[PDB]
Ligand binder design. Structure first.
Ligand SMILES: OC[C@H]1O[C@@H](O[C@H]2[C@H](O[C@H]3[C@H](O[C@H]4[C@H](O[C@H]5[C@H](O[C@H]6[C@H](O[C@H]7[C@H](O[C@H]8[C@H](O[C@H]9[C@H](O[C@H]%10[C@H](O[C@H]%11[C@H](O[C@H]%12[C@H](O[C@@H]%13[C@@H](O)[C@H](O)[C@@H](CO)O[C@H]%13O)O[C@H](CO)[C@@H](O)[C@@H]%12O)O[C@H](CO)[C@@H](O)[C@@H]%11O)O[C@H](CO)[C@@H](O)[C@@H]%10O)O[C@H](CO)[C@@H](O)[C@@H]9O)O[C@H](CO)[C@@H](O)[C@@H]8O)O[C@H](CO)[C@@H](O)[C@@H]7O)O[C@H](CO)[C@@H](O)[C@@H]6O)O[C@H](CO)[C@@H](O)[C@@H]5O)O[C@H](CO)[C@@H](O)[C@@H]4O)O[C@H](CO)[C@@H](O)[C@@H]3O)O[C@H](CO)[C@@H](O)[C@@H]2O)[C@H](O)[C@@H](O)[C@@H]1O
Ligand SMILES: OC[C@H]1O[C@@H](O[C@H]2[C@H](O[C@H]3[C@H](O[C@H]4[C@H](O[C@H]5[C@H](O[C@H]6[C@H](O[C@H]7[C@H](O[C@H]8[C@H](O[C@H]9[C@H](O[C@H]%10[C@H](O[C@@H]%11[C@@H](O)[C@H](O)[C@@H](CO)O[C@H]%11O)O[C@H](CO)[C@@H](O)[C@@H]%10O)O[C@H](CO)[C@@H](O)[C@@H]9O)O[C@H](CO)[C@@H](O)[C@@H]8O)O[C@H](CO)[C@@H](O)[C@@H]7O)O[C@H](CO)[C@@H](O)[C@@H]6O)O[C@H](CO)[C@@H](O)[C@@H]5O)O[C@H](CO)[C@@H](O)[C@@H]4O)O[C@H](CO)[C@@H](O)[C@@H]3O)O[C@H](CO)[C@@H](O)[C@@H]2O)[C@H](O)[C@@H](O)[C@@H]1O
Lengths: 503, 502
């Protein structure tokens, strides 16, 4: 046993920061390194040796992950008696696992735990609802039980003139779960070349969501180009907007469709996610952000047709800062993807002030894992962003030839708020553009969602292929009556603003 | 003045002994250059409606003005069916407003171009039946949204010479009874190669329009291709081979499939294509029971069209009223970039070569409704999906494209006896004209309580010839689904790869 609490973990992290980084894990055995995802996920932990097996009337239990594939960090695991503030280490032993000890090619296999996952009544040994695995990455599910997007303890150099640094959770301490409890507490040591951290997660496993109360203290070993707080990681391959990568049986493929920001000044932003041809970074200035999230608001199975991944059942993630974070940017990185496996969306909070060796930080935030975020704009909300050819009347698209003029059609569909009561008074879109002009601007009632479509044709004013930034909110009798739609469009090359008639 | 169906047949017979009157005179500029918007703004005088005088009428009729490509003078006659006496309704300028100034304001001899019928409570708007253009007509069910068309007749739609479009040159309307939602219109069909006498008994029912059609046809000339009970639709973008899908609309089509109930009782589901190159298929049959172009995806969210409402557009079912013998269901698919080209043609072509002097009589019923009146009692195709293969579902590589080129097919089945069949073993029976079906899976789809058949098509030949495919489900020795019939267009060999543009 040893003395353990959050204060001791902070000293540990602080003291670790004054010693040289332990460095990258040793390479795995080849049987583990070359192991397929299907083989990796078939590894069987001995349910009789579950972390909380000895707790009467337990509503939660926990098991560990084996090292394998890219998961090569030994993670040290401890049980904490919260009454006595005493931690005991749980030692890896091979007998805890089956189907871990032969490779893809049957070749027979020091090792350790790679992470943990938590199960809930009524299924204490299957269908885990929280999981920590790989670097500082974790995920949770809601009542659909379907895993989608990830969070991380921290992001470092995700978008800068040098390679991303991935911090690792190197140790977790589990408070022994109480009888009847659907909340558990886990402490984590974060360790990286640039930075150490002490984390406390108080994790609420509710009927329809997981709520994590996160507290961290960070201690910078080195100058850092980019510090990303409360990082989220998702994937967008094909949605309703700029469908360049949609050649599958699935009308849409994504773990999230949008970035949602509740700003320091009280403004709501809806930023539809892109799968761009070229790597893209955006930084959104804010001061005391109230919340931000990567949201999956299209719940319609018929929009995905995925009976393996169930994208339509995947959760939203909402970050709620528990203090004033001051000046900084919401960073959004969008990687070009051809499919599903690449985590091509990253979002984080980057404080304004440049990070120096010896800097300390303390952040508190709540994570909400659920179909809907816990808060949304009370005004009209963007339901979907659609793009395609413009330069013709809806209902009368020419079949005999392509449109004579090149333009890109935008349809932004709004629902909820006070659209019903406002419509008779007159609803106007307020559209600003970094380039081009919005023509044939229409405000059209959409009976099947009881909503309004703002449709316009973007005509280029420049041959430039620079990203085109767009903002739109609805006004009525001198008030904003919708959240702000913020879009980034990639116009084609000049010689591609025309149609090849291949028939 | 004396008129009945016997007299119409003598007229069409005698017409056929004379040379074709030829194509209509060109229109004045005012009318020739109208946009659809300007043409659809032409206003008929509702006070001069055809049955304005009929007490408690549940139907009324108005006429169309000439305009755009609607150049044929169509003569219109009122028939008292009680007395068999007909009087011509003469065209007058006074019957129309917004007909006499062009899109460029230029100020406007002429006739009627067609007719439309209105149903209580909207006797002057939102028409449910319309005859306009050549021998074309449409009807709507209880959505009241227009979609696909039918024609009286098709000639040379797909041959080594230009299509010939027969025209309806005259219509005779039985005066409607009070309370009746059925009307009778007779039509004279006139074309270079052929004349006809048509009788339509048109039932404007609560949820559908049913048309009892009888014709008598008289061939002036040899005919390379006679098309009986032709239908005409549009398929731009669906779930299958999505080459023309660059709009805000996940799908655009008036129909998604050809459904055939064959003489031997087989049900075929043939998903429609928007091919890169003009395509024709002839489906051999003998005494066909029914065939139709169906719009079975009714989900607004799958089209997002708040102008055309594709999801509200009707299916059209042809039910022969006799044994039609040997022949083919013709299907032509024209490449389209949009909505306005009627890129889908379907008709019955009798086996026997048509000769100058030949006469024919066909009886068929037309059902205009969301669903056809009959469907396969076994499992049915809900949808046909295509995309990249060569990877596992849920694990499509994002770091790179699949290493191997294959086309993935997903055929979703619903209904019949799948529930009871499932624990006994469902097997797909797949046949291909070329290539190989691999990673064949049968998968439960909880949300539609149905089964997906998924397979990856790997090519065996450099050929870019069309690849024909068939699939039906079998369980313990029995067919338990309709027959899926697909035509696939493999890319050129040096396009059987993915360019990594990022
Ligand atoms: O009994 C009961 C039951 O059972 C059953 O059975 C079944 C089962 O069930 C179960 C389940 O659950 C489970 C889960 O599962 C799930 C899955 O998952 C999976 C995953 O997936 C996913 C993914 O994601 C993930 C990840 O991964 C990834 C990676 O990542 C990484 C990172 O990355 C990063 C990056 O980095 C990179 C780089 O990149 C670069 C960059 O950087 C730059 O910028 C650029 C410029 O351009 O470039 C690029 O490229 O690179 C490099 C190379 O060089 C590398 O190295 C690196 O890495 O970056 C970026 C930026 O920043 C970012 O963003 C990213 O992130 O990184 C890190 C560090 O290093 C690491 O750590 C990581 O990992 O990546 C890779 C590459 O790229 C890729 O590929 C991958 O993918 O991972 C993470 C961590 O861990 C996580 O968080 C995530 O999530 O993907 C996607 C998206 O994208 C998504 O969506 C997915 O989801 O994956 C993994 C691996 O593989 C594994 O582990 C797993 O498993 O999935 C599926 C599909 O989707 C689903 O469905 C599921 O669900 O899992 C969990 C754990 O996690 C567990 O716990 C559970 O359990 O399911 C269900 C429902 O929910 C449940 O309930 C159950 O439980 O399942 C299975 C499947 O699995 C099957 O098999 C079976 O069957 C039965 O059936 C029944 O009956 C019963 O009842
Ligand atoms: O419901 C609710 C509401 O609404 C309304 O109502 C109303 C209505 O309205 C509606 C609208 O409608 C409109 C329409 O639309 C539609 C369309 O369709 C139609 C058509 O049109 C077309 C045309 O047609 C024609 C034909 O054609 C044919 C072809 O032929 C041609 C050629 O082609 C060629 C071929 O042949 C070959 O094979 C190839 C080789 O590759 O090539 C190609 O190219 O060409 C030539 C030149 O060069 C020419 O000439 C010819 O023509 O063929 C094919 C094959 O066979 C076939 O298929 C086709 O069909 O032809 C004939 C003979 O001549 C004629 O007659 C006709 O016309 O065409 C054109 C060109 O392309 C186009 O553009 C167009 O579009 O028409 C017909 C007759 O009339 C009919 O039936 C139909 O329908 O389209 C689409 C499809 O695609 C659809 O969807 C639509 O719908 O249009 C019209 C014109 O413009 C007008 O008038 C109308 O109005 O629509 C809208 C949108 O969608 C909707 O929404 C609505 O609804 O209407 C009615 C009437 O009809 C009335 O009554 C009503 O009222 C309102 O508002 C209310 O009321 C309601 O409630």
């Amino acid at each position: 046993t040893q003395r353990f609490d959050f204060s001791i973990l902070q000293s540990m992290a602080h003291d670790l920061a004054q010693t040289a980084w332990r460095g990258a894990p040793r390479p795995l055995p080849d049987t583990l390194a070359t192991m397929t995802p299907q083989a990796y996920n078939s590894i069987q932990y001995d349910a009789e040796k579950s972390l909380w097996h000895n707790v009467e009337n337990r509503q939660l239990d926990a098991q560990f992950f084996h090292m394998g594939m890219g998961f090569r960090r030994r993670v040290r695991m401890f049980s904490v008696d919260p009454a006595t503030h005493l931690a005991r280490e749980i030692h890896f032993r091979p007998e805890l696992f089956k189907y871990n000890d032969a490779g893809v090619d049957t070749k027979q296999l020091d090792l350790g735990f790679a992470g943990f996952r938590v199960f809930k009544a009524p299924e204490l040994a299957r269908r885990d609802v929280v999981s920590f695995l790989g670097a500082s990455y974790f995920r949770a599910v809601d009542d659909t039980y379907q895993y989608g997007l990830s969070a991380r303890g921290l992001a470092i150099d995700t978008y800068t003139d040098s390679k991303e640094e991935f911090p690792d959770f190197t140790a977790f301490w589990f408070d022994t779960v109480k009888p009847g409890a659907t909340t558990f507490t886990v402490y984590a040591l974060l360790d990286s070349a640039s930075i150490t951290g002490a984390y406390k997660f108080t994790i609420h496993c509710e009927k329809s969501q997981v709520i994590m109360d996160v507290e961290n203290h960070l201690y910078a070993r080195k100058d850092i180009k980019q510090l990303g707080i409360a990082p989220m990681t998702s994937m967008f391959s094909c949605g309703t907007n700029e469908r360049r990568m949609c050649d599958t049986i699935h009308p849409q493929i994504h773990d999230s469709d949008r970035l949602s920001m509740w700003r320091g000044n009280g403004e709501w932003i809806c930023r539809p996610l892109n799968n761009p041809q070229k790597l893209q970074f955006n930084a959104y200035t804010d001061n005391n952000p109230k919340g931000f999230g990567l949201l999956q608001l299209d719940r319609d199975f018929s929009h995905y047709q995925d009976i393996m991944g169930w994208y339509n059942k995947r959760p939203s993630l909402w970050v709620e800062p528990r203090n004033k974070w001051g000046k900084g940017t919401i960073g959004l990185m969008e990687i070009p993807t051809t499919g599903e496996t690449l985590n091509n969306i990253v979002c984080f909070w980057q404080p304004e002030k440049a990070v120096k060796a010896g800097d300390e930080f303390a952040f508190q935030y709540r994570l909400y894992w659920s179909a809907q975020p816990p808060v949304h704009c009370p005004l009209a909300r963007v339901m979907a962003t659609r793009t395609g050819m413009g330069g013709f009347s809806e209902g009368w698209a020419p079949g005999e030839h392509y449109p004579e003029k090149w333009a890109r059609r935008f349809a932004v569909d709004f629902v909820g708020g006070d659209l019903k009561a406002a419509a008779p008074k007159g609803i106007e879109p307020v559209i600003t553009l970094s380039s081009g002009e919005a023509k044939q601007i229409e405000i059209l009632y959409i009976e099947p969602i009881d909503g309004y479509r703002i449709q316009f044709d973007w005509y280029p004013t420049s041959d430039s292929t620079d990203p085109v930034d767009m903002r739109m909110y609805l006004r009525c009798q001198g008030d904003a009556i919708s959240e702000t739609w913020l879009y980034q469009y990639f116009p084609p090359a000049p010689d591609k603003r025309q149609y090849v008639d291949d028939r």
